[PDB]
Amino acid sequence: TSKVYDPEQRKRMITGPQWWARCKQMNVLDSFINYYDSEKHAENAVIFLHGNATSSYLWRHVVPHIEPVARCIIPDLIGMGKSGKSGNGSYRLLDHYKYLTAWFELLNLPKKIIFVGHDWGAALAFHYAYEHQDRIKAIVHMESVVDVIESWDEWPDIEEAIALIKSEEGEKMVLENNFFVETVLPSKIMRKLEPEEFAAYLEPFKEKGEVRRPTLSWPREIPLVKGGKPDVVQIVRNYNAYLRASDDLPKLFIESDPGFFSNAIVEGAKKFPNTEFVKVKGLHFLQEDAPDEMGKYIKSFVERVLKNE
Numbered sequence: 001t002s003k004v005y006d007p008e009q010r011k012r013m014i015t016g017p018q019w020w021a022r023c024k025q026m027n028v029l030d031s032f033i034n035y036y037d038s039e040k041h042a043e044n045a046v047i048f049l050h051g052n053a054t055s056s057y058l059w060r061h062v063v064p065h066i067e068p069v070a071r072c073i074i075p076d077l078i079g080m081g082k083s084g085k086s087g088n089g090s091y092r093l094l095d096h097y098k099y100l101t102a103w104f105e106l107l108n109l110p111k112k113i114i115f116v117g118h119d120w121g122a123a124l125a126f127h128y129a130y131e132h133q134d135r136i137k138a139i140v141h142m143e144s145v146v147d148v149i150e151s152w153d154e155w156p157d158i159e160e161a162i163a164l165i166k167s168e169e170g171e172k173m174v175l176e177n178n179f180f181v182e183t184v185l186p187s188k189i190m191r192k193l194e195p196e197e198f199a200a201y202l203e204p205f206k207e208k209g210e211v212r213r214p215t216l217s218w219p220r221e222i223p224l225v226k227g228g229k230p231d232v233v234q235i236v237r238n239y240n241a242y243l244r245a246s247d248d249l250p251k252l253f254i255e256s257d258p259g260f261f262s263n264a265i266v267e268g269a270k271k272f273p274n275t276e277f278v279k280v281k282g283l284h285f286l287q288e289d290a291p292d293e294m295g296k297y298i299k300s301f302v303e304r305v306l307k308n309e
């Protein structure tokens, strides 16, 4: 079987170099962050955070829907997209968080921020929110790291999968074969990407070896209490308890099709109060199959949050 191009998508395609020319760079700590900033309507800030395998490019067709109502800021996480590399070559959640929060300090942000998070980008938003509970206006999340995986909540073979990614076989899958870009990314998009769109995702990780480390380090942070990184399990424990009790924080959850990793996410998200639920037909990288539906859903949600404020 093979997937097929969307015949109407090529008309509006934005290549990597087209996107990267639209971005800015700012030095941050011992490195720098590449990011997109629509600048206008700076009274609010909507910060879009990608997760593993991707970059700010993931949001290119989503963000135009929100720009008319709020300043949109979209970083490439450290070591990803066109950003700088981490000073110590470490790419754990806390390394990403260190660069992200230092970048926030330089952005002239409003007091209360709106976050839109996918995958580990949602973990970063949730952790920031837990540590800055007075800085959060609303959180949109999707395919998110919502909670830990307790021993009794393990589903069949999650043990196998995490042992695989933490093994040397997993390291070679990523560092040598570029598993998350070459395999996972296209496998979790329903359409076939245009060659230029795939090239934009490949470009940061085109060379073999250690440059692909961020895409290996992210899954190894998974908060499986059985053998998971204790610091990340505690981080997720803390922000999950905060989210479960955050009755006054408006949230939007965008659901996609069920998957091997997906079922724990949706059940965890329904434990957070004040959550508006919506659905798009897509897989994990749902931005590539329903960007306009997503953008219109986020826009209505932001409009409702602001008007009701």
Ligand SMILES: O=c1n(Cc2ccc(O)cc2)nc2c(Cc3ccccc3)nc(-c3ccc(O)cc3)cn12
Pocket: 119, 157, 158, 160, 161, 162, 164, 165, 184, 188, 219, 260, 261, 284
């Ligand atoms: O579906 C999937 N993806 C696709 C996917 C990846 C990330 C994401 O966010 C959503 C979807 N990837 C796997 C992997 C490899 C892997 C990836 C990331 C972390 C840990 C392991 N391994 C298994 C598996 C291996 C043995 C086994 O017995 C059962 C399952 C399934 N995978």
